[PDB]
Amino acid sequence: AANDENYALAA
Amino acid sequence: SALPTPHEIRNHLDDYVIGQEQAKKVLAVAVYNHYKRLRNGDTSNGVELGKSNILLIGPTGSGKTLLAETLARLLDVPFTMADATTLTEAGYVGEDVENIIQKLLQKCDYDVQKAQRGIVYIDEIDKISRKSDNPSITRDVSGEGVQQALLKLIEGTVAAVPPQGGRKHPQQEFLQVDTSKILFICGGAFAGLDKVISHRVETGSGIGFGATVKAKSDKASEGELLAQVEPEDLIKFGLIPEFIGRLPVVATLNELSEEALIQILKEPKNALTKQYQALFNLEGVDLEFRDEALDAIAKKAMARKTGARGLRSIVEAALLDTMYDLPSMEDVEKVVIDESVIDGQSEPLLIYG
Amino acid sequence: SALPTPHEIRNHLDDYVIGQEQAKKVLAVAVYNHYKRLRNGDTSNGVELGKSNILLIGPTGSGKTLLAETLARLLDVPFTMADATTLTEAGYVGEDVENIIQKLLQKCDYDVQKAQRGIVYIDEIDKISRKSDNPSITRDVSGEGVQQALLKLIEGTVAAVPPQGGRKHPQQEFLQVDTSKILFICGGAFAGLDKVISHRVETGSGIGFGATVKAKSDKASEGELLAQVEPEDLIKFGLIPEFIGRLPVVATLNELSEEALIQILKEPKNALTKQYQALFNLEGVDLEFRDEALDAIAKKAMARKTGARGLRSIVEAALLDTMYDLPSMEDVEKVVIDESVIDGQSEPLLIYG
Ligand SMILES: Nc1ncnc2c1ncn2[C@@H]1O[C@H](COP(=O)(O)OP(=O)(O)OP(O)(O)=S)[C@@H](O)[C@H]1O
Numbered sequence: 206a207a208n209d210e211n212y213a214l215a216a
Numbered sequence: 217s218a219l220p221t222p223h224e225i226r227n228h229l230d231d232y233v234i235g236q237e238q239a240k241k242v243l244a245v246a247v248y249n250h251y252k253r254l255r256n257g258d259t260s261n262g263v264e265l266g267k268s269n270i271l272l273i274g275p276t277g278s279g280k281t282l283l284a285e286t287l288a289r290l291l292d293v294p295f296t297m298a299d300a301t302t303l304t305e306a307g308y309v310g311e312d313v314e315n316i317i318q319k320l321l322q323k324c325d326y327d328v329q330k331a332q333r334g335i336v337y338i339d340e341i342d343k344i345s346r347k348s349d350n351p352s353i354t355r356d357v358s359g360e361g362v363q364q365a366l367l368k369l370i371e372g373t374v375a376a377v378p379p380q381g382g383r384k385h386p387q388q389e390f391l392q393v394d395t396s397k398i399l400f401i402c403g404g405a406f407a408g409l410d411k412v413i414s415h416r417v418e419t420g421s422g423i424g425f426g427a428t429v430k431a432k433s434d435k436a437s438e439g440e441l442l443a444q445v446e447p448e449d450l451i452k453f454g455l456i457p458e459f460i461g462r463l464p465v466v467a468t469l470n471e472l473s474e475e476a477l478i479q480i481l482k483e484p485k486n487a488l489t490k491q492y493q494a495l496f497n498l499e500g501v502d503l504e505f506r507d508e509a510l511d512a513i514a515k516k517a518m519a520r521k522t523g524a525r526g527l528r529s530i531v532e533a534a535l536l537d538t539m540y541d542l543p544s545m546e547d548v549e550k551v552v553i554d555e556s557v558i559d560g561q562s563e564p565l566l567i568y569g
Numbered sequence: 570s571a572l573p574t575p576h577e578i579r580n581h582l583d584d585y586v587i588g589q590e591q592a593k594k595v596l597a598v599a600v601y602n603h604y605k606r607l608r609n610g611d612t613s614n615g616v617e618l619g620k621s622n623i624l625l626i627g628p629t630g631s632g633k634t635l636l637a638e639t640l641a642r643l644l645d646v647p648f649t650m651a652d653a654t655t656l657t658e659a660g661y662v663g664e665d666v667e668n669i670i671q672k673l674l675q676k677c678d679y680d681v682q683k684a685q686r687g688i689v690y691i692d693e694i695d696k697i698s699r700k701s702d703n704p705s706i707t708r709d710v711s712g713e714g715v716q717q718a719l720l721k722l723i724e725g726t727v728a729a730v731p732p733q734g735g736r737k738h739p740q741q742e743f744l745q746v747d748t749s750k751i752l753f754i755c756g757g758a759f760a761g762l763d764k765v766i767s768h769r770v771e772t773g774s775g776i777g778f779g780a781t782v783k784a785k786s787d788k789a790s791e792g793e794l795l796a797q798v799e800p801e802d803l804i805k806f807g808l809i810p811e812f813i814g815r816l817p818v819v820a821t822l823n824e825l826s827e828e829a830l831i832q833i834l835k836e837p838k839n840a841l842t843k844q845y846q847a848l849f850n851l852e853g854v855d856l857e858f859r860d861e862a863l864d865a866i867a868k869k870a871m872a873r874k875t876g877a878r879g880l881r882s883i884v885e886a887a888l889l890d891t892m893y894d895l896p897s898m899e900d901v902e903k904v905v906i907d908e909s910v911i912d913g914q915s916e917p918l919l920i921y922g
């Protein structure tokens with residue numbers, strides 16, 4: 206999977 | 217089948233640990249009670265049995281960490297060991313407190329029921345102690361944030377433990393594991409706690425004629441001061457009253473002595489002498505020691521004030537030159553260490569044949 | 570297969586190192602003992618072996634960093650270096666302590682099993698020492714904090730490191746690398762430690778007629794004082810007693826002299842003089858040195874107090890004008906350097922074929 210499994214991220 | 221009595225558990229620990237009877241009894245009693253609570257899972261009695269956590273306050277190299285590792289070899293329920301230093305409150309790059317539960321789940325094959333009845337050990341608890349000198353204006357996440365987060369977890373609360381523990385996204389789904397019955401054991405070598413206790417217990421300072429004068433020899437030993445420990449003293453160290461309140465059981469450890477240290481060389485299952493003796497056996501060489509040599513070694517280690525770990529330093533120094541050329545020689549069967557060898561006035565007596 | 574003996578290991582290290590027999594012996598024994606622990610699971614008897622971490626103390630340019638780099642050439646297990654200054658407490662912008670283990674995995678292609686028996690070297694460990702931080706006015710993430718995190722890591726514990734930087738959130742499966750069998754070597758130059766040891770060794774109970782001891786003392790070299798180092802002295806330098814307790818064996822280094830520097834210029838394989846010879850040989854030009862020149866070089870190096878690294882500065886400064894125009898002309902077969910050339914009152918002699 207070139208794209209990450211999670212698009213949203215948390216800082 | 218049948219819950220083992222505390223005597224059986226204590227006897228097993230004696231094979232790997234020497235001394236510290238109070239700590240052994242407290243740990244054995246806690247395990248015995250935990251097993252009994254697990255047995256009556258239905259809880260026919262109307263009253264809801266409440267758990268009691270344990271705290272360990274002892275000097276460095278006193279067997280605090282060793283006791284936890286040895287207990288795992290005898291326990292049957294899940295057991296885990298964590299480090300409080302790496303812990304950080306939620307919402308920061310540091311791992312969350314809930315990650316500890318994730319580790320326990322791995323041991324029990326991700327079983328919620330098993331994790332609820334599991335045991336957890338914590339180390340370096342003294343490091344997270346707050347700094348009274350530091351003003352409250354600056355937020356502390358490593359020391360203060362961890363204590364505040366462990367309050368609900370220790371007392372018993374539902375924790376949204378992640379499946380793997382790597383990250384905790386709000387949108388992500390997490391497993392719910394209650395901690396109402398889980399037992400936690402905290403340990404740590406509180407540095408400077410004896411000074412606070414002595415100031416409060418003695419209160420003998422004063423230069424005036426009326427004020428009493430106390431000699432330095434009259435001062436109690438560090439181990440003795442630790443015995444007269446109260447929650448108020450720990451609060452001065454930097455622990456919030458809420459955290460210490462969750463820990464009603466307090467246990468202390470005594471510093472090792474020359475006579476006790478001598479036993480550590482041979483009585484333990486994995487004693488230092490056994491490791492070195494076996495290390496020489498796999499090379500076709502025999503190793504022997506003398507009781508007089510052990511006394512000198514223990515006496516020197518006490519000066520280092522580093523605990524049992526100091527013994528490894530002394531042995532390495534004496535046998536440094538030996539191993540440097542041990543396999544180079546030939547026609548050697550046994551090696552004998554004399555008392556003078558430890559003092560540096562002689563070399564090991566090689567046995568040929 | 571047969572494990573190499575310490576003598577063979579010392580011979581290879583003696584090529585790239587000079588006058589470090591004491592340090593070379595300790596390193597050779599450790600690697601030899603480490604390999605023995607790898608061939609057998611625990612022992613023929615069945616008891617596990619505790620590891621012994623090495624602590625290297627020596628002035629700058631004494632070969633502390635060189636020893637680790639040279640040792641990697643003879644090691645058949647994963648090896649990696651680290652910087653203590655970068656390390657910081659968890660939950661901070663600074664590099665995490667667990668990242669050190671991550672570097673080791675890179676060497677063995679992310680193999681958890683190989684890393685478990687790897688060797689790790691740490692440099693400039695004195696930087697994390699406390700600087701009069703005994704009151705603990707504020708927590709030091711770069712200092713005392715780093716030591717606390719390394720306490721359990723050196724002893725042995727599970728480390729959660731991402732296999733591929735958290736590829737996917739579900740089923741992350743963070744690698745659990747136990748460091749119970751991973752050797753650790755710490756090294757750093759300590760400034761002021763000699764004075765601490767001198768004060769302890771210095772006699773004199775009191776001043777005045779009442780004093781029963783004259784307090785006579787004699788000047789001692791830096792290396793001599795470091796040999797008498799004890800854990801108590803390190804504690805006063807700003808190190809936690811628990812931390813030093815994890816390093817049982819301590820090795821010291823000495824300074825260099827004219828004879829040592831002179832030998833280092835020609836005896837080692839990758840010597841400074843040999844490097845310049847190869848750089849000139851490829852251009853069809855031969856280079857030769859003289860004993861008198863090396864003497865001036867050694868004196869100038871120790872006169873500037875720049876250590877072994879200062880040698881390069883003097884050599885290049887003497888051959889700057891020489892190589893600035895060497896490619897221009899031709900028909901030159903050999904070059905000769907004299908003592909007067911180093912002094913700056915002469916010039917190198919050129920030989921035409
Ligand atoms: N009674 C004992 N019997 C055998 N080994 C012991 C004993 N007490 C200490 N040790 C040794 O000391 C080490 C265990 O140190 P611990 O006392 O458990 O930890 P600590 O030094 O008190 O603080 P931490 O948590 O390790 S930073 C091991 O190397 C043990 O072999």
Ligand SMILES: Nc1ncnc2c1ncn2[C@@H]1O[C@H](COP(=O)(O)OP(=O)(O)OP(O)(O)=S)[C@@H](O)[C@H]1O
Nearest residue numbers: 585586587628629630631632633634635758833877
């Ligand atoms: N005995 C030696 N033989 C050859 N080169 C040496 C020797 N001792 C030092 N060097 C040189 O010194 C450099 C390596 O630095 P070190 O000697 O390890 O000093 P250091 O301890 O690394 O200083 P730092 O910056 O505090 S790590 C290289 O340029 C080596 O060539």
